[PDB]
Each structure stands twice: as structure tokens, then as C-alpha cells.
Amino acid sequence: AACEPVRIPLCKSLPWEMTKMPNHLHHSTQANAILAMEQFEGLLGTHCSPDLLFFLCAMYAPICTIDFQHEPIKPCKSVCERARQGCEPILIKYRHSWPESLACDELPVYDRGVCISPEAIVTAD
Amino acid sequence: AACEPVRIPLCKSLPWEMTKMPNHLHHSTQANAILAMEQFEGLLGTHCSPDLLFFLCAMYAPICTIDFQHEPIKPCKSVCERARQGCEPILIKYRHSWPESLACDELPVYDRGVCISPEAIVTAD
């Protein structure tokens, strides 16, 4: 299984352009990841967390590395936590819940100890 | 340039094993990064920071990705700050300071927005 370009529209604005399946939702093809991501357009529009996009894209289309072949690197537990703390209340307010598949507590890979996180960037309008 | 195996002794205990040059000290070959790490054996031995090893290896032998061809992914500024916070006082006590090459303010690649960080593993050993 080799790398493939990211094709999730909402994720193209992020830093990396190469991903590899299966992703962290266990989708075998990116076509399934694309469909899955569409469900988040509304929550993303509420700006409940500046880290929600990064977290979702790190889960649905993880950056490709030659190390970690079967289970790609994952977003840091701390980033998942920031996203959940900011967005779960909004989901709740609208009679929905944070999905178990995005639970932060069992996010980390046993015996690994490395993850990816966002970093401040220089931007304007 | 393509990935190459990590050969710095002290970094082999880390999660990844494939890196790519130049590293973040601008070494063209890993051979020179090896000589450098040797100089940090003393500081690493004081256990002034549990993040120092990760930080130094993230700088001297960064994880290989297909993305970021010319400048590999860097360790997060926050990981650098924790390592400097715990270790700088020790360097000062013995008339040294945090080196210019490892300045934390220089880690963010301002038009990128992603970095690598360590994360706790679940162990009792």
C-alpha cells in the first residue's frame, strides 16, 4: 500500500497533500472518506474549534509516511481533546453527540508515542 | 533525495526509523548528525527533560514523509519549549545556554502548519 494524493475538498487547505488508506475510521478507499467528511460541513461552519478541521483531516486523510504502514500517524490526543471540548457542546445543543469513532481516550497507538499537531502559521484575510 | 534509515544510536529507541536529509541543522548527511548527538549525551544523562531525546532526534533525524521534500516536518514549538524549560537551567549552571540551532521560535514553518510531537504510551514496566 503506497501513498495517494488527498482528495477530500475541505482538507486541501491543510499542509500535507499525500495520504494513505486505510485511514483512522478504517475506510479502505478515500472515496468513503470523502463521503464521510461531508457530514461535518455544518459543524465546521460553526467555528466551534480552530482545530476541528486539522483533527478531522488527520483522521480521515492521515499524512503519508513510510514508517507506520498499516496504521498511519494520528493527530495528538491533545488536539482531539481541544476539538471535542469546543465542538461537543454544539453537537449536543443540536441533539447530536460526539461520535465514538472520534473518541480521544483510545486514540493513541500502543507502543508508539508520536503524533501530529497543528502549528501557528502566518496568514491574513 | 529519498528516505534513509535512522542511524543515530540514541534515536533508535524512538517510534520511527526512516529519515531524510537535510535535517534541521542543515546537515547533508546523517554522518554529521551522529557526531553532534554525541555532544548531548551529558545533558541527556541529567534527565532534565523527558522530551529532550524526542526533540533532538526530531531535529537531527526527522521522520520521512513524501510531503515536505526540501524541509522535513519539524518537532512542535511546544515540545522544544518544554525541553528548553527543563534543561536550560542545567546548561546555565555550567556556563552554557540553549544553542542557536535549537531556538524554539525558529521551528514553525510559517506557511505550513503541522509538526510532530511525542505522546505518552501506556506502560507499567
Side-chain angles (χ1 to χ4, degrees), chain A residues 3 15-18 54 63-68 73 76-77 108 111-122, chain B residues 3 15-18 54 63-68 73 75-77 108-110 112-119 121:
Chain A
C3 308
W16 67 98
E17 310 183 306
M18 296 304 292
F54 182 95
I63 184 178
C64 198
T65 60
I66 60 187
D67 279 291
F68 315 141
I73 194 168
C76 294
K77 182 180 262 191
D111 282 304
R112 183 173 290 173
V114 62
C115 52
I116 53 158
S117 158
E119 188 80 290
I121 64 180
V122 162
Chain B
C3 309
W16 69 95
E17 55 181 74
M18 291 303 288
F54 176 95
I63 185 168
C64 200
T65 59
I66 282 196
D67 279 291
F68 316 134
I73 196 160
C76 300
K77 178 175 179 175
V109 171
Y110 287 123
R112 181 178 294 174
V114 63
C115 52
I116 198 165
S117 157
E119 195 163 52
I121 174 194

Side-chain angles (χ1 to χ4, degrees), chain A residues 40 43-46 48-58 79 82-84 87 98 102:
Chain A
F40 290 101
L43 186 65
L44 278 171
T46 68
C48 46
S49 176
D51 297 311
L52 181 65
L53 181 68
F54 182 95
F55 170 68
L56 296 178
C57 297
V79 187
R82 284 205 293 287
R84 180 172 182 154
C87 299
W98 185 254
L102 302 178

Side-chain angles (χ1 to χ4, degrees), chain A residues 87-106:
Chain A
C87 299
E88 177 167 47
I90 302 309
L91 284 165
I92 289 175
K93 171 181 176 59
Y94 294 111
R95 291 160 175 168
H96 276 274
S97 298
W98 185 254
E100 206 298 319
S101 58
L102 302 178
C104 311
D105 299 296
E106 283 186 57

Side-chain angles (χ1 to χ4, degrees), chain B:
Chain B
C3 309
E4 61 183 66
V6 171
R7 290 185 294 105
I8 304 178
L10 292 172
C11 301
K12 300 174 184 170
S13 71
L14 292 172
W16 69 95
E17 55 181 74
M18 291 303 288
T19 179
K20 186 178 173 184
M21 301 298 273
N23 60 18
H24 298 306
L25 280 307
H26 310 292
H27 295 319
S28 262
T29 78
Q30 191 166 172
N32 275 297
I34 291 175
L35 192 54
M37 288 288 299
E38 277 173 30
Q39 87 183 78
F40 284 112
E41 271 178 51
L43 191 64
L44 281 164
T46 69
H47 307 295
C48 44
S49 177
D51 301 303
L52 181 63
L53 178 68
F54 176 95
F55 173 62
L56 295 172
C57 298
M59 289 301 281
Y60 288 94
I63 185 168
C64 200
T65 59
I66 282 196
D67 279 291
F68 316 134
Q69 185 52 37
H70 300 301
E71 182 168 37
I73 196 160
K74 293 193 179 164
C76 300
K77 178 175 179 175
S78 67
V79 181
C80 181
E81 296 187 317
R82 286 199 302 283
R84 191 192 188 301
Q85 189 171 64
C87 297
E88 172 78 328
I90 289 306
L91 292 165
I92 291 174
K93 176 182 175 187
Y94 305 108
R95 294 188 192 160
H96 294 298
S97 51
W98 197 246
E100 185 183 333
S101 55
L102 303 176
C104 304
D105 281 335
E106 292 307 302
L107 292 175
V109 171
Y110 287 123
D111 55 342
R112 181 178 294 174
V114 63
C115 52
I116 198 165
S117 157
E119 195 163 52
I121 174 194
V122 180
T123 187
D125 66 11

